[PDB]
Design a protein around this motif. Structure first.
Motif, PDB file in Angstrom:
ATOM      1  N   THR A 132     -41.115  -1.049-135.993  1.00 36.07           N
ATOM      2  CA  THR A 132     -39.825  -1.832-135.672  1.00 36.07           C
ATOM      3  C   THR A 132     -39.074  -1.094-134.464  1.00 36.07           C
ATOM      4  O   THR A 132     -38.985   0.120-134.866  1.00 36.07           O
ATOM      5  N   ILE A 133     -38.478  -1.822-133.647  1.00 34.97           N
ATOM      6  CA  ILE A 133     -37.635  -1.265-132.873  1.00 34.97           C
ATOM      7  C   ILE A 133     -36.411  -2.258-132.541  1.00 34.97           C
ATOM      8  O   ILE A 133     -36.547  -3.614-132.432  1.00 34.97           O
ATOM      9  N   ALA A 134     -35.269  -1.867-133.028  1.00 34.11           N
ATOM     10  CA  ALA A 134     -34.136  -2.724-132.919  1.00 34.11           C
ATOM     11  C   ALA A 134     -32.909  -2.038-132.089  1.00 34.11           C
ATOM     12  O   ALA A 134     -32.700  -0.914-132.131  1.00 34.11           O
ATOM     13  N   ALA A 135     -32.700  -2.709-131.126  1.00 32.62           N
ATOM     14  CA  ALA A 135     -31.965  -2.066-129.811  1.00 32.62           C
ATOM     15  C   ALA A 135     -30.716  -3.041-129.036  1.00 32.62           C
ATOM     16  O   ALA A 135     -31.036  -4.177-129.175  1.00 32.62           O
ATOM     17  N   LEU A 136     -29.676  -2.375-128.830  1.00 37.03           N
ATOM     18  CA  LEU A 136     -28.694  -3.110-128.135  1.00 37.03           C
ATOM     19  C   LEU A 136     -28.152  -2.149-126.927  1.00 37.03           C
ATOM     20  O   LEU A 136     -27.553  -0.857-127.233  1.00 37.03           O
ATOM     21  N   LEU A 137     -28.273  -2.409-125.964  1.00 38.49           N
ATOM     22  CA  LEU A 137     -27.854  -1.817-124.677  1.00 38.49           C
ATOM     23  C   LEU A 137     -26.882  -2.470-124.102  1.00 38.49           C
ATOM     24  O   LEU A 137     -26.910  -3.790-123.888  1.00 38.49           O
ATOM     25  N   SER A 138     -25.544  -2.000-124.065  1.00 41.92           N
ATOM     26  CA  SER A 138     -24.195  -2.779-123.431  1.00 41.92           C
ATOM     27  C   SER A 138     -23.223  -2.065-122.668  1.00 41.92           C
ATOM     28  O   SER A 138     -22.593  -2.575-122.362  1.00 41.92           O
TER      29      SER A 138
END
Lengths: 7, 7, 7, 7, 7, 7, 7, 7, 7, 7, 7, 7, 7, 7, 7, 7, 7, 7, 7, 7
Positions: S1-7
């Motif tokens: 699993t990968i959960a990512a947020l690039l902001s």
């Protein structure tokens, strides 16, 4: 399945 | 706008 | 079953 | 808008 | 069964 | 508008 | 059975 | 506008 | 089946 | 199945 | 917006 | 089961 | 926003 | 904006 | 089970 | 499964 | 923000 | 902004 | 699993 | 900002 919205 | 469902 | 709403 | 149910 | 509304 | 039911 | 409304 | 259902 | 509306 | 709306 | 349930 | 909301 | 439940 | 669900 | 909220 | 929102 | 539960 | 869930 | 947020 | 969970 693919569900997509390009807006 | 492009909306699509493919299944 | 596949349910989708795209807007 | 797209509303769909595939069953 | 396939139900769809596209608008 | 398209409203469809394939059954 | 195929039912459709296109407008 | 292009609306389509293919099944 | 194909149901389409090009407008 | 493909359901699409290009607008 | 996309709301989907694949079951 | 897969449920998702993307907005 | 993405809200998802894979079960 | 690009929204997609692939499963 | 995988639950996630990304905002 | 892939769920993505590029905005 | 990311809130996740993998179980 | 890029949000993604891959599982 | 990968959960990512690039902001 | 970069947020990620990898498991």
């Amino acid at each position: 399945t693919i569900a997509a919205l390009l807006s």
